[PDB]
Amino acid sequence: HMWLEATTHPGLEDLLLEELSALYPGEGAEVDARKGRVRIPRAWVGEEALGLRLAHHLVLFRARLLLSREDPLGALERAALALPWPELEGAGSFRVEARREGEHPFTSPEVERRVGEALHRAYGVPVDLKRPAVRVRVDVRGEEAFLGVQLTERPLSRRFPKAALRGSLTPVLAQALLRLADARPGMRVLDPFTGSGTIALEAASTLGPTSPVYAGDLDEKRLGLAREAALASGLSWIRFLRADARHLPRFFPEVDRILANPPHGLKEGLFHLYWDFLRGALALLPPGGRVALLTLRPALLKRALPPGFALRHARVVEQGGVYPRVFVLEKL
Protein backbone atom coordinates (compact mmCIF):
# COMPACT_ATOMS: atom_id res chain seq x y z
CA HIS A 1 0.00 0.00 0.00
CA MET A 2 1.61 3.20 -1.20
CA TRP A 3 1.08 6.91 -0.39
CA LEU A 4 1.87 10.14 -2.12
CA GLU A 5 2.78 12.72 0.51
CA ALA A 6 2.71 16.42 -0.40
CA THR A 7 4.06 19.18 1.86
CA THR A 8 2.94 22.83 2.04
CA HIS A 9 3.09 25.63 4.68
CA PRO A 10 1.55 24.52 7.98
CA GLY A 11 -1.96 26.00 7.99
CA LEU A 12 -2.63 25.37 4.28
CA GLU A 13 -3.38 21.56 4.51
CA ASP A 14 -7.09 21.96 3.79
CA LEU A 15 -6.37 23.82 0.50
CA LEU A 16 -3.71 21.37 -0.52
CA LEU A 17 -6.20 18.59 0.19
CA GLU A 18 -8.70 20.24 -2.20
CA GLU A 19 -6.07 20.48 -4.99
CA LEU A 20 -5.03 16.84 -4.52
CA SER A 21 -8.63 15.63 -4.37
CA ALA A 22 -9.44 17.28 -7.69
CA LEU A 23 -6.35 15.63 -9.19
CA TYR A 24 -6.97 12.21 -7.57
CA PRO A 25 -10.60 11.54 -6.68
CA GLY A 26 -11.23 8.73 -4.22
CA GLU A 27 -11.22 8.11 -0.49
CA GLY A 28 -8.65 7.59 2.29
CA ALA A 29 -6.88 10.99 2.17
CA GLU A 30 -5.00 11.87 5.39
CA VAL A 31 -4.16 15.39 6.75
CA ASP A 32 -1.62 16.12 9.48
CA ALA A 33 -3.17 19.22 11.14
CA ARG A 34 -0.67 22.04 11.68
CA LYS A 35 2.16 20.01 10.08
CA GLY A 36 1.77 21.04 6.44
CA ARG A 37 1.33 17.45 5.12
CA VAL A 38 -1.37 15.63 3.15
CA ARG A 39 -1.19 11.95 2.04
CA ILE A 40 -3.29 10.21 -0.64
CA PRO A 41 -3.13 6.38 -1.12
CA ARG A 42 -1.98 5.80 -4.69
CA ALA A 43 -1.20 2.72 -6.84
CA TRP A 44 0.76 5.04 -9.20
CA VAL A 45 2.03 8.66 -9.32
CA GLY A 46 2.92 10.27 -12.68
CA GLU A 47 3.91 13.76 -13.87
CA GLU A 48 0.45 15.13 -13.11
CA ALA A 49 1.48 15.46 -9.45
CA LEU A 50 4.14 18.00 -10.45
CA GLY A 51 1.37 20.43 -11.54
CA LEU A 52 0.33 21.07 -7.91
CA ARG A 53 0.36 24.76 -7.04
CA LEU A 54 0.08 24.41 -3.26
CA ALA A 55 2.91 21.90 -2.78
CA HIS A 56 6.55 22.38 -1.86
CA HIS A 57 7.86 18.76 -2.02
CA LEU A 58 6.38 15.41 -3.07
CA VAL A 59 7.46 11.98 -1.64
CA LEU A 60 6.23 8.55 -2.75
CA PHE A 61 6.12 6.34 0.34
CA ARG A 62 6.28 2.72 -0.78
CA ALA A 63 5.92 1.25 2.71
CA ARG A 64 4.31 2.24 5.94
CA LEU A 65 4.82 0.07 8.98
CA LEU A 66 4.42 -0.21 12.69
CA LEU A 67 7.88 0.02 14.16
CA SER A 68 8.89 -2.89 16.21
CA ARG A 69 10.40 -1.75 19.49
CA GLU A 70 12.50 -4.75 19.38
CA ASP A 71 15.38 -3.74 17.05
CA PRO A 72 13.78 -0.76 15.32
CA LEU A 73 16.89 -0.07 13.19
CA GLY A 74 16.98 -3.69 11.98
CA ALA A 75 13.29 -3.52 11.08
CA LEU A 76 13.81 -0.33 9.02
CA GLU A 77 16.78 -1.86 7.18
CA ARG A 78 14.71 -4.99 6.38
CA ALA A 79 11.74 -2.87 5.24
CA ALA A 80 13.99 -0.79 2.92
CA LEU A 81 15.56 -3.92 1.43
CA ALA A 82 12.12 -5.47 0.73
CA LEU A 83 11.12 -2.46 -1.49
CA PRO A 84 11.95 -1.69 -5.18
CA TRP A 85 14.18 1.38 -5.92
CA PRO A 86 14.16 1.80 -9.71
CA GLU A 87 15.09 5.55 -9.31
CA LEU A 88 18.58 4.50 -8.35
CA GLU A 89 18.60 3.65 -12.09
CA GLY A 90 20.34 6.33 -14.12
CA ALA A 91 20.86 8.32 -10.92
CA GLY A 92 24.41 7.35 -9.92
CA SER A 93 24.38 8.95 -6.49
CA PHE A 94 21.96 9.09 -3.55
CA ARG A 95 21.52 9.89 0.11
CA VAL A 96 19.00 9.04 2.84
CA GLU A 97 17.18 11.90 4.62
CA ALA A 98 15.55 10.65 7.82
CA ARG A 99 13.19 12.64 10.05
CA ARG A 100 11.65 11.74 13.41
CA GLU A 101 8.64 12.88 15.40
CA GLY A 102 8.17 11.55 18.95
CA GLU A 103 10.64 9.91 21.33
CA HIS A 104 12.84 7.06 20.01
CA PRO A 105 16.01 5.36 21.32
CA PHE A 106 17.82 6.20 18.01
CA THR A 107 18.66 9.42 16.09
CA SER A 108 17.98 10.40 12.48
CA PRO A 109 21.66 10.11 11.47
CA GLU A 110 21.63 6.44 12.75
CA VAL A 111 18.68 5.67 10.47
CA GLU A 112 20.45 7.32 7.53
CA ARG A 113 23.58 5.29 8.09
CA ARG A 114 21.87 1.92 8.57
CA VAL A 115 19.43 2.37 5.62
CA GLY A 116 22.00 4.06 3.31
CA GLU A 117 24.71 1.44 3.84
CA ALA A 118 22.16 -1.35 3.20
CA LEU A 119 21.11 0.30 -0.07
CA HIS A 120 24.66 1.10 -1.13
CA ARG A 121 25.55 -2.55 -0.58
CA ALA A 122 22.51 -3.88 -2.56
CA TYR A 123 22.65 -1.25 -5.38
CA GLY A 124 26.32 -0.20 -5.63
CA VAL A 125 25.36 3.49 -6.13
CA PRO A 126 27.57 5.92 -4.13
CA VAL A 127 26.30 8.09 -1.30
CA ASP A 128 26.65 11.83 -2.03
CA LEU A 129 25.62 14.01 0.93
CA LYS A 130 25.77 17.46 -0.76
CA ARG A 131 24.62 16.75 -4.34
CA PRO A 132 22.62 13.48 -4.24
CA ALA A 133 20.91 12.63 -7.52
CA VAL A 134 18.05 10.85 -5.66
CA ARG A 135 16.89 11.37 -2.09
CA VAL A 136 15.63 8.35 -0.16
CA ARG A 137 13.21 9.39 2.62
CA VAL A 138 12.58 7.58 5.90
CA ASP A 139 10.21 9.34 8.31
CA VAL A 140 9.49 7.93 11.74
CA ARG A 141 6.37 9.40 13.34
CA GLY A 142 5.41 8.05 16.73
CA GLU A 143 5.08 4.29 16.30
CA GLU A 144 4.87 4.21 12.46
CA ALA A 145 7.53 4.55 9.79
CA PHE A 146 7.26 5.57 6.12
CA LEU A 147 9.93 4.71 3.51
CA GLY A 148 10.20 5.90 -0.09
CA VAL A 149 11.71 8.38 -2.52
CA GLN A 150 11.49 12.14 -2.93
CA LEU A 151 9.91 12.90 -6.34
CA THR A 152 10.84 16.57 -6.49
CA GLU A 153 14.48 17.72 -6.76
CA ARG A 154 13.87 21.43 -6.33
CA PRO A 155 10.59 22.42 -4.61
CA LEU A 156 7.67 23.08 -6.98
CA SER A 157 7.42 26.47 -5.38
CA ARG A 158 10.61 27.55 -7.23
CA ARG A 159 8.47 28.84 -10.12
CA PHE A 160 8.99 32.46 -11.24
CA PRO A 161 12.66 32.64 -10.06
CA LYS A 162 13.13 36.11 -11.63
CA ALA A 163 10.65 37.41 -9.04
CA ALA A 164 12.23 35.34 -6.19
CA LEU A 165 14.79 35.73 -3.39
CA ARG A 166 12.29 38.45 -2.49
CA GLY A 167 11.15 37.87 0.00
CA SER A 168 9.89 35.20 2.33
CA LEU A 169 6.78 35.12 0.10
CA THR A 170 6.48 31.92 -1.95
CA PRO A 171 4.28 31.28 -4.98
CA VAL A 172 2.52 28.67 -2.75
CA LEU A 173 1.43 31.40 -0.30
CA ALA A 174 0.37 33.59 -3.21
CA GLN A 175 -1.80 30.72 -4.64
CA ALA A 176 -3.35 30.29 -1.15
CA LEU A 177 -4.34 34.01 -1.00
CA LEU A 178 -5.93 33.59 -4.44
CA ARG A 179 -7.98 30.58 -3.27
CA LEU A 180 -8.89 32.03 0.14
CA ALA A 181 -10.21 35.16 -1.66
CA ASP A 182 -12.20 32.88 -3.99
CA ALA A 183 -10.73 34.54 -7.12
CA ARG A 184 -12.03 32.97 -10.40
CA PRO A 185 -11.21 33.45 -14.12
CA GLY A 186 -12.77 36.68 -15.43
CA MET A 187 -12.41 38.60 -12.10
CA ARG A 188 -10.34 41.78 -11.81
CA VAL A 189 -7.48 41.32 -9.34
CA LEU A 190 -5.17 43.86 -7.67
CA ASP A 191 -1.75 43.15 -6.04
CA PRO A 192 -1.15 46.43 -4.14
CA PHE A 193 2.32 45.64 -2.67
CA THR A 194 3.69 43.74 -5.58
CA GLY A 195 7.48 43.91 -5.00
CA SER A 196 9.17 41.78 -7.67
CA GLY A 197 5.78 40.52 -8.78
CA THR A 198 5.13 37.09 -7.15
CA ILE A 199 1.44 37.53 -6.30
CA ALA A 200 0.60 39.13 -9.69
CA LEU A 201 2.39 36.40 -11.64
CA GLU A 202 0.72 33.62 -9.60
CA ALA A 203 -2.68 35.22 -10.20
CA ALA A 204 -2.09 35.76 -13.99
CA SER A 205 -0.71 32.25 -14.45
CA THR A 206 -3.71 30.72 -12.60
CA LEU A 207 -6.63 32.87 -13.86
CA GLY A 208 -5.42 33.34 -17.49
CA PRO A 209 -5.89 36.40 -19.75
CA THR A 210 -9.66 36.95 -19.19
CA SER A 211 -8.79 38.33 -15.71
CA PRO A 212 -7.36 41.88 -15.68
CA VAL A 213 -4.42 41.93 -13.18
CA TYR A 214 -3.20 45.24 -11.69
CA ALA A 215 -0.06 45.40 -9.56
CA GLY A 216 1.57 48.31 -7.82
CA ASP A 217 4.71 49.25 -5.98
CA LEU A 218 6.86 52.29 -5.15
CA ASP A 219 10.21 50.68 -6.08
CA GLU A 220 10.86 51.12 -9.84
CA LYS A 221 13.75 48.65 -9.76
CA ARG A 222 11.55 45.87 -8.43
CA LEU A 223 8.88 46.76 -11.02
CA GLY A 224 11.58 46.29 -13.71
CA LEU A 225 12.20 42.76 -12.42
CA ALA A 226 8.49 42.00 -12.22
CA ARG A 227 7.99 43.05 -15.88
CA GLU A 228 10.94 40.89 -16.92
CA ALA A 229 9.50 37.91 -15.08
CA ALA A 230 6.03 38.44 -16.59
CA LEU A 231 7.53 38.41 -20.10
CA ALA A 232 9.69 35.30 -19.44
CA SER A 233 6.59 33.23 -18.54
CA GLY A 234 4.20 34.69 -21.18
CA LEU A 235 2.17 36.72 -18.65
CA SER A 236 2.52 40.12 -20.22
CA TRP A 237 -1.01 41.39 -19.81
CA ILE A 238 -0.32 42.31 -16.13
CA ARG A 239 -0.48 46.11 -15.65
CA PHE A 240 2.46 46.96 -13.39
CA LEU A 241 2.39 50.55 -12.16
CA ARG A 242 4.43 52.74 -9.84
CA ALA A 243 1.82 53.31 -7.13
CA ASP A 244 1.51 54.29 -3.47
CA ALA A 245 -0.68 51.77 -1.60
CA ARG A 246 -1.78 54.55 0.79
CA HIS A 247 -3.58 56.22 -2.17
CA LEU A 248 -4.77 53.28 -4.33
CA PRO A 249 -7.62 55.15 -6.01
CA ARG A 250 -5.07 57.63 -7.56
CA PHE A 251 -3.76 54.65 -9.59
CA PHE A 252 -6.22 51.74 -9.93
CA PRO A 253 -9.86 51.25 -10.94
CA GLU A 254 -12.47 49.13 -9.16
CA VAL A 255 -11.53 45.41 -8.91
CA ASP A 256 -13.17 42.22 -7.52
CA ARG A 257 -10.31 40.81 -5.42
CA ILE A 258 -7.30 42.38 -3.68
CA LEU A 259 -4.44 40.11 -2.57
CA ALA A 260 -2.26 42.05 -0.16
CA ASN A 261 1.12 41.35 1.47
CA PRO A 262 1.99 44.64 3.29
CA PRO A 263 5.61 45.34 4.33
CA HIS A 264 6.73 44.15 7.81
CA GLY A 265 8.15 47.55 8.78
CA LEU A 266 8.86 51.01 7.37
CA LYS A 267 4.53 51.05 14.56
CA GLU A 268 2.55 54.30 14.32
CA GLY A 269 3.81 54.60 10.71
CA LEU A 270 2.68 51.04 10.14
CA PHE A 271 -0.76 51.75 11.62
CA HIS A 272 -1.11 54.71 9.27
CA LEU A 273 -0.19 52.59 6.25
CA TYR A 274 -2.80 49.98 7.23
CA TRP A 275 -5.36 52.72 7.86
CA ASP A 276 -4.94 54.36 4.43
CA PHE A 277 -4.48 51.10 2.55
CA LEU A 278 -7.63 49.45 3.94
CA ARG A 279 -9.74 52.51 3.17
CA GLY A 280 -8.43 52.67 -0.40
CA ALA A 281 -9.12 48.94 -0.74
CA LEU A 282 -12.73 49.38 0.41
CA ALA A 283 -13.20 52.19 -2.10
CA LEU A 284 -11.95 49.97 -4.96
CA LEU A 285 -14.36 47.07 -4.36
CA PRO A 286 -18.05 46.55 -5.23
CA PRO A 287 -20.35 45.15 -2.54
CA GLY A 288 -19.23 41.48 -2.28
CA GLY A 289 -15.63 42.31 -3.35
CA ARG A 290 -12.99 40.56 -1.18
CA VAL A 291 -9.48 41.15 0.22
CA ALA A 292 -7.12 38.36 1.29
CA LEU A 293 -4.35 39.74 3.36
CA LEU A 294 -1.30 38.47 5.16
CA THR A 295 -0.03 40.15 8.37
CA LEU A 296 2.23 39.58 11.39
CA ARG A 297 0.18 42.17 13.28
CA PRO A 298 -3.46 40.99 13.53
CA ALA A 299 -4.42 43.22 16.46
CA LEU A 300 -3.15 46.34 14.70
CA LEU A 301 -4.76 45.32 11.39
CA LYS A 302 -8.08 44.80 13.13
CA ARG A 303 -7.80 48.11 14.90
CA ALA A 304 -7.36 49.78 11.46
CA LEU A 305 -10.27 47.98 9.71
CA PRO A 306 -12.98 50.29 8.47
CA PRO A 307 -16.52 49.23 9.44
CA GLY A 308 -17.60 48.75 5.79
CA PHE A 309 -15.63 45.43 5.83
CA ALA A 310 -16.78 42.19 7.43
CA LEU A 311 -14.03 39.91 8.68
CA ARG A 312 -15.11 36.58 7.10
CA HIS A 313 -12.16 34.23 7.80
CA ALA A 314 -8.89 34.27 9.66
CA ARG A 315 -6.28 31.55 9.88
CA VAL A 316 -2.72 31.10 11.02
CA VAL A 317 -0.07 30.03 8.41
CA GLU A 318 3.65 29.29 8.83
CA GLN A 319 5.96 31.35 6.64
CA GLY A 320 9.76 31.51 6.92
CA GLY A 321 9.73 30.17 10.50
CA VAL A 322 7.11 32.67 11.80
CA TYR A 323 3.30 32.73 11.90
CA PRO A 324 1.42 35.45 10.02
CA ARG A 325 -2.39 35.46 9.89
CA VAL A 326 -4.37 35.46 6.64
CA PHE A 327 -7.60 37.48 6.88
CA VAL A 328 -10.34 37.44 4.28
CA LEU A 329 -12.46 40.60 4.27
CA GLU A 330 -15.66 41.16 2.33
CA LYS A 331 -17.10 44.55 1.50
CA LEU A 332 -20.68 44.71 2.82
Swiss-Prot record:
Q: Which UniProt keywords apply?
A: Cytoplasm, Methyltransferase, RNA-binding, S-adenosyl-L-methionine, Transferase, tRNA processing
Name the principal localization, coarsely classed. cytoplasm
Q: Which GO terms describe its cellular component?
A: cytoplasm
Q: Name one GO molecular function term.
A: tRNA (guanine(6)-N2)-methyltransferase activity
Q: What is its EC number?
A: 2.1.1.256
Q: What class of enzyme is it?
A: transferase
Record family assignment: Belongs to the methyltransferase superfamily.
SUBUNIT field: Monomer in solution.
What UniProt notes about the protein's domains is: Consists of an N-terminal THUMP domain fused to a catalytic Rossmann-fold MTase (RFM) domain.
Q: Please state what the protein is called.
A: tRNA (guanine(6)-N2)-methyltransferase
| Organism listed in the record | Thermus thermophilus (strain ATCC BAA-163 / DSM 7039 / HB27)
